């Protein structure tokens, strides 16, 4: 079978009211398990406490990266081409291990960019996203950051949550 891990970031440039600039919702095999304020290091509502995903080495590493990804996207959001950047990072392991790592970028609810970590291809989804693609495609550091975190780090937490999800059962 196949398993996935979805991280949905909501990054805001110039927050207006009591809005937090960083928010992240996560799902293991399509369903929720953590809502996290990546800006103040705070778990807000990690529903699904019957698998103790926390109490895994991956848990803290995971939060570490969630914060780093949030900070990188923040700076990038600050020099774009209040602005709300919604990003979904995902990785999925098949029956072999064929991990598909990809990113999805939106700016106001309309998909803008898609990153295929595997093939490392930036593909435009919106006419107005042609420039950010260029910038980020040329920002080899950013693009590699997107490949490394989704192709390895994310597969790593997936593996540990799963390996842990079983040892309990069997």
């Amino acid at each position: 079978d196949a398993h996935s891990l979805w991280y949905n970031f909501t990054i805001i440039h110039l927050p207006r009211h009591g809005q937090q600039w960083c928010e992240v919702q996560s799902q293991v095999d399509q369903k929720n398990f953590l809502s996290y304020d990546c800006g103040s290091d705070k778990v807000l509502s990690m529903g699904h406490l019957e698998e103790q995903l926390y109490a895994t080495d991956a848990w803290g590493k995971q939060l570490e990266m969630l914060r780093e990804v949030g900070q990188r996207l923040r700076l990038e959001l600050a020099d774009t081409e209040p602005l709300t950047l919604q990003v979904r990072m995902s990785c999925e392991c098949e029956a072999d291990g064929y991990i598909r790592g990809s990113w999805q970028f939106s700016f106001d609810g309309r998909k803008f960019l898609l990153f295929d970590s595997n093939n490392r291809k930036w593909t435009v989804v919106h006419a107005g996203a042609r420039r950010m693609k260029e910038k980020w495609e040329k920002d080899s550091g950013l693009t590699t950051f997107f490949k490394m975190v989704s192709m390895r780090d994310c597969k790593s937490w997936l593996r540990d949550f799963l390996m842990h999800r079983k040892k309990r059962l069997e």
Binding site: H13, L14, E68, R74, L75, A78
Partner: protein, 123 residues
Amino acid sequence: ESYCGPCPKNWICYKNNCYQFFDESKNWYESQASCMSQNASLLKVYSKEDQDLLKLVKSYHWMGLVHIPTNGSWQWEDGSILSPNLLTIIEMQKGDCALYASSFKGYIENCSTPNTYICMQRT
């Protein structure tokens, strides 16, 4: 082969300059105060040459850069003015203070919002 200038205890010595990163989040004022209480100041960028290791830095941190309410230019704590050739300033948030970010970039931030910081001490 040689030695690297006099620097406080356990501080990154490079090109005769001393740095120290604090994981403690303070606002600009609170940070600036911290560096002062250690015979040092907040990071100051004068040379991409003498301070190239700055493009090695991960995350954003307070630097001793402030905004002048009138002429709209930026100056360091010491009074000198930012020289056209070192930093690229992008607005991240309101404020009159600037955070440093890897690859000589200065991000504008609310002077009162808590952040990590970098104390320096020109040898």
